[PDB]
Amino acid sequence: SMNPPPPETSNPNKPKRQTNQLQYLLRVVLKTLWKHQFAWPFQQPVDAVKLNLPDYYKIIKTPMDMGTIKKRLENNYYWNAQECIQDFNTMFTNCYIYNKPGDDIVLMAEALEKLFLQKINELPTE
Numbered sequence: 001s002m003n004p005p006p007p008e009t010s011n012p013n014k015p016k017r018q019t020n021q022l023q024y025l026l027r028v029v030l031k032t033l034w035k036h037q038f039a040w041p042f043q044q045p046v047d048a049v050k051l052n053l054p055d056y057y058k059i060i061k062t063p064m065d066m067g068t069i070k071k072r073l074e075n076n077y078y079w080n081a082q083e084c085i086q087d088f089n090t091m092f093t094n095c096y097i098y099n100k101p102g103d104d105i106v107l108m109a110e111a112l113e114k115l116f117l118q119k120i121n122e123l124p125t126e
């Protein structure tokens with residue numbers, strides 16, 4: 001199997017804005033996660049070809065990753081903070097669906113997700 005195309009990151013037909021929450025999501029949340037020691041599995045789409053995971057996109061129908069999220073933020077692709085938060089949650093969920101408890105990658109996801117949730121608890125006002 002081929003990899004699916006990556007998620008769209010730009011769309012001139014989708015309205016754009018910058019909000020304090022979206023700024024925080026890029027500058028604090030994304031950037032903090034991105035530099036973490038456990039970020040590497042999550043910095044780009046899962047390359048099921050390169051990793052020889054033929055079933056990955058048979059199981060995961062809503063792929064998402066931080067590279068995509070970063071580009072969406074940088075492109076002002078999101079209108080609502082919740083769209084971005086949802087993308088992060090989808091990314092984590094995919095990991096938990098595909099992988100098993102105690103797998104290194106699941107422990108990595110848990111740790112990154114705990115940091116993510118901590119940071120979104122600090123989202124500034126609307």
Ligand SMILES: Cc1cc(/N=N/c2ccc(S(=O)(=O)Nc3ccccn3)cc2)cc(C)c1O
Nearest residue numbers: 040041042043046047051053094095098099105
């Ligand atoms: C979310 C997710 C990621 C993944 N594999 N991801 C990668 C990402 C990057 C590399 S890397 O080889 O470019 N960089 C590395 C590889 C190992 C340690 C540090 N950096 C390898 C696997 C595999 C699975 C199932 C999965 O559910």
